[PDB]
A paper describes a structure:
Also known as eIF4A2, an isoform of DDX2A. Two of the structures show unique P-loop conformations. The DDX2B structure features an α-helix 4 that is longer than in other helicases, and leads into an unusually closed P-loop conformation. As a consequence, the ATP binding site is not visible on the surface of the DDX2B structure. This conformation is most likely induced by a crystal contact in this region.
DExD/H-box RNA helicases, from virus and bacteria to eukaryotes, play important roles in processes including ribosome biogenesis, RNA processing and folding, ribonucleoprotein (RNP) remodeling, RNA nuclear export, the regulation of RNA translation and transcription, and nonsense-mediated RNA decay. DExD/H-box proteins often contain accessory regulatory domains and localization modules, but their cores consist of two RecA-like domains joined by a short flexible linker. The N-terminal domain is commonly referred to as conserved domain-1, or DEAD-domain, and the C-terminal domain as conserved domain-2, or helicase domain. Both domains contribute to the binding site for RNA substrates and both contribute to ATP hydrolysis. We used X-ray crystallography to determine the structures of the DEAD-domains of DDX2A, DDX2B, DDX5, DDX10, DDX18, DDX20, DDX47, DDX52, and DDX53, as well as the helicase domains of DDX25 and DDX41.
Numbering used by the authors: 30 to 137, 151 to 236
Write the structure that this text describes.
Amino acid sequence: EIVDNFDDMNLKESLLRGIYAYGFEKPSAIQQRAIIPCIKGYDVIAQAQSGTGKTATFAISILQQLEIEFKETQALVLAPTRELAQQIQKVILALGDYMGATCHACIGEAPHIVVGTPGRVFDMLNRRYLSPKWIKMFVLDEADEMLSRGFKDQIYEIFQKLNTSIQVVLLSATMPTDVLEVTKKFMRDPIRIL
């Protein structure tokens, strides 16, 4: 399914409000393919380059699925660097600005979303500063870069701390062997968008 406009995606009013306020008009090719299966809760592998359109894809998907009145961390995003983590927080907070979504960057009240590098997130879990109990969505951004930087084993230990029932969304410009190994381990009949 390709849905070529945001109004036909069954998104919440308050979320669409953030989308139009940000300045988006028409969904990009990745947004037209990926938003729907992400919001339906499927595991998703998306081959996508760095960019706002990519970030807004998983931001929208997370935001649509949040229970805003439940003040617990419901989604966890891993990125290769503190700078990328901060960009993601910035995009998420702009898009969620009309729905009361909270988002903290873990880069060295519980927020709805935490985004950070694998090392910092792993530490936060070990120190009980982040509870895995209510995390329903686990997003791995630029997975190729995280794995090339040597984060595989810390990513695996994080995944081990999360509930069995999570949705996993993995985004990567390239799909090397190591990336494909993670999708096979972490995902169940994933949607593939390559």
